Amino acid sequence: KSPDSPQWRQHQQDVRNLNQYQTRGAFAYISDQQKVYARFFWQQTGQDRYRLLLTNPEGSTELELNAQPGNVQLVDNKGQRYTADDAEEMIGKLTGMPIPLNSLRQWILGLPGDATDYKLDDQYRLSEITYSQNGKNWKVVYGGYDTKTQPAMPANMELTDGGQRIKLKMDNWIVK
Template sequence: MRIILVVFTLLWLSGCAYKAEKAPAGSWLAQKNALAQLQQWQLSARLGIITSDERGSLSLFWRQNRNDYRMNLTNVVGKRVFDLSRQGRSVQLTDSDGQQHQAADARELVQRLTGWDLPVEQLSYWIKGLPGATDQVTYDEHGRPSTIKAHGWELRYLGYTQIEGLWLPSRLDLSHQDTKLRLAINQWELN
């Protein structure tokens, strides 16, 4: 009888411990878990870019499907600047002349062809307001990321909007050496 009571008590305590680890609704941990599980989404935005050589305003369309993505940048008159996509391990960039270029690293490919240093792979997380495991993060009064420092980049989240119960960034600034990016997201779609 004593063994049964000990086993029952241990099972009950392990059940309580499991429940205690579950993130309370509305907490940053619950938000972070939901963002990590968000594998399919798309957005449209305005992207301001400033480098030592140029400055401009572009339209950005991004569609993410698990680890694959398509990022399309067009200028103010709607002409393609470039179309960048990743499928599996292959990254392909189609430039404004329709020429296709391939590489294994999106950041290197974009920098080589445009001169812009864009943190493409990290951006798919940062754009959702999801810091990486080793990123330095400060949080706002609601527990959402306010700034992130990682990979030589500094991000400032300037606004959030609530979409389907998630707080997603609506405006953010990114800076790295002589590159500054300002992103104003017009529309989120979550699948």
């Protein structure tokens, strides 16, 4: 489908009209040197503030990161807290996972962000993203959306780049 439809724009308007977003589920990070599997919890207020939490089956925190414009705190899988200006930069350097946090804060909401190459589906909802810019590269595939929310929010997504893929499966969402 084409991103021209005046609907795909209203939906983006729908999503962007929300103030808070909250989802959770299973997170899996896979590369050649690592394999991360954990429950994840993503809370977000606005387009600039969010908290990503990764927890072990036991409940132990494998990773906690709270981001705000120009200020991010990252808590170790050990418990050691670090602070920086860029989250995308911090996740990579201290955990090995160069997760595109700065772009994800848009894509997780089912928004393109600055993506210049994507597609839609029947319902005029972001379905595929081919990102190769700002020095980074990621192929984002949007699976089934959570339609128990208004507007529907993604409940399935896979981002891949080379030998590394990040899979997100949402159990549910709570938007306001």
